[PDB]
Design a protein around this ligand. Structure first.
Ligand SMILES: Nc1ncnc2c1ncn2[C@@H]1O[C@H](COP(=O)(O)CP(=O)(O)OP(=O)(O)O)[C@@H](O)[C@H]1O
Ligand code: CON
Ligand SMILES: [Mg+2]
Length: 129
């Protein structure tokens, strides 16, 4: 009976290096690629919302955010959303990981093979990148 959106917007920028939570510790698996949440709500548009949710987390400036696409996972009583504002040129350090680690990830044109099926609706598009 509620709804919420997430102004994450992965941030690939070395070639396709996103600041995604990439198993900081050496993991035996490789599907630990979630998405730097942030919760869009500030202002009243995915711009001031994600952009302001961008600085409020780390504290950089650039990043050249871009929509690219977004999903909407529906739950029994949880209407969630997840704006994927993909950026590609942050200053020195990135900025987006919510309560997650968020770390540069040398993936290479995402494939969804390293990302969990949970965010299937958007990971399907990264696959194309
Ligand atoms: N993909 C997802 N699946 C399920 N729940 C999600 C989700 N993305 C976000 N949520 C949940 O929905 C809540 C959104 O409410 P908000 O309080 O507006 C977030 P927030 O506290 O403003 O931002 P924050 O993400 O920086 O903590 C989050 O606390 C999160 O737990
Ligand atoms: N910005 Co929050 N209140 N679920 N940590
Ligand atoms: Mg936030």
């Amino acid at each position: 009976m509620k709804k919420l959106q997430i102004a994450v917007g992965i941030i690939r920028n070395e070639n396709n290096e996103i600041f995604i939570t990439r198993r900081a510790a050496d993991a035996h698996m490789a599907n630990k690629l979630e998405f730097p949440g942030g919760k869009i709500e500030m202002g009243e548009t995915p711009e001031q919302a994600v952009v302001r949710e961008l600085q409020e987390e780390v504290g950089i400036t650039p990043q050249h955010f871009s929509l690219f696409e977004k999903l909407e996972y529906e739950f029994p009583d949880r209407h969630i959303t997840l704006w994927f504002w993909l950026v590609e040129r942050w200053e020195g350090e990135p900025w987006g990981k919510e309560g997650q680690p968020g770390e540069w990830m040398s993936l290479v044109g995402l494939n969804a093979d390293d990302f969990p099926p949970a965010n299937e609706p958007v990971i399907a598009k990264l696959k194309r990148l």
